[PDB]
Design a protein around this ligand. Structure first.
Ligand SMILES: [Ca+2]
Ligand SMILES: [Ca+2]
Length: 246
């Protein structure tokens, strides 16, 4: 609706600190250590689309794609009732309850299509408190998650200034990257040029149960276009669903 009170934001900050202790930022799946991701068969994607004049109605979508073919083998799109407004740094408290429900519906409907990793539209550890939406989803479902954002969250000294734009120019081909280094000296994520015919990078960060280098490489392998195909197909299908109900 409208901006939540400081009371709520405080509880939200506190919940993010509690759950962060459960993030695993290294590889835990055998396919992640494989040079060609052998053993990876199913990649998930999630998105939530909203309506222009409607602050309460949204559409949440979960897709599972075959890998490496990137063919949609499962789709579930759902109209939902929004509770929280969008506040930067608290994106999870607006969308993640609906995404968790989608995962549980998949487990009940098609348990053999449970994805081995989820691409999440939004950051993971690249976040004001080191616990973005992709970490939040990963910890609540225990699935490996990757954060993929289209704009750079300005945290820990990260800035979309002239130097940052110089480096983006230096990205020349799909798969090129440069690291996002915080003022503490830690690597929060990578800027990734996802396709040869696109210049605007993706900003990839660890969600849960994956390393950054594997996350970046897998993100690149899913990009038929600029947006990785799992996120792209959830975006397309959730928006089409809004359109038919409007
Ligand atoms: Ca989204
Ligand atoms: Ca979207």
């Amino acid at each position: 609706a409208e901006r939540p009170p400081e009371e709520t934001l405080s509880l939200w900050k506190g919940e993010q600190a509690r759950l962060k202790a459960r993030v695993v930022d290294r590889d835990t799946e055998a396919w992640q250590r494989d040079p060609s991701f052998s053993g990876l068969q199913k990649v998930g994607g999630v998105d939530v689309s909203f309506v222009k004049g409607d602050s309460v109605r949204a559409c949440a979508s979960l897709v599972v794609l075959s890998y490496p073919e990137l063919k949609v083998v499962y789709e579930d799109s759902r109209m939902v009732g929004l509770k929280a407004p969008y506040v930067s740094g608290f994106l999870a408290f607006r969308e993640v309850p609906f995404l968790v429900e989608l995962v549980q519906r998949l487990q009940e409907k098609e348990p053999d299509l449970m994805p081995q990793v989820v691409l999440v539209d939004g950051n993971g550890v690249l976040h004001q408190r080191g616990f973005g939406v992709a970490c939040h989803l990963g910890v609540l479902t225990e699935l490996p998650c990757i954060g993929v954002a289209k704009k750079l969250l300005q945290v820990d000294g990260l800035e979309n200034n002239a130097l940052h734009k110089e480096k983006i120019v230096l990205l020349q081909a799909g798969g090129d990257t440069f690291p996002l280094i915080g003022s503490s000296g830690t690597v929060l994520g990578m800027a990734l040029r996802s396709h040869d015919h696109s210049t605007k990078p993706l900003y990839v960060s660890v969600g849960h149960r994956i390393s950054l280098e594997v996350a970046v490489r897998l993100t690149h392998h899913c990009c038929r276009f600029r947006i990785p195909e799992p996120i792209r197909q959830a975006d397309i299908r959730s928006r089409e669903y809004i359109r038919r109900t409007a």
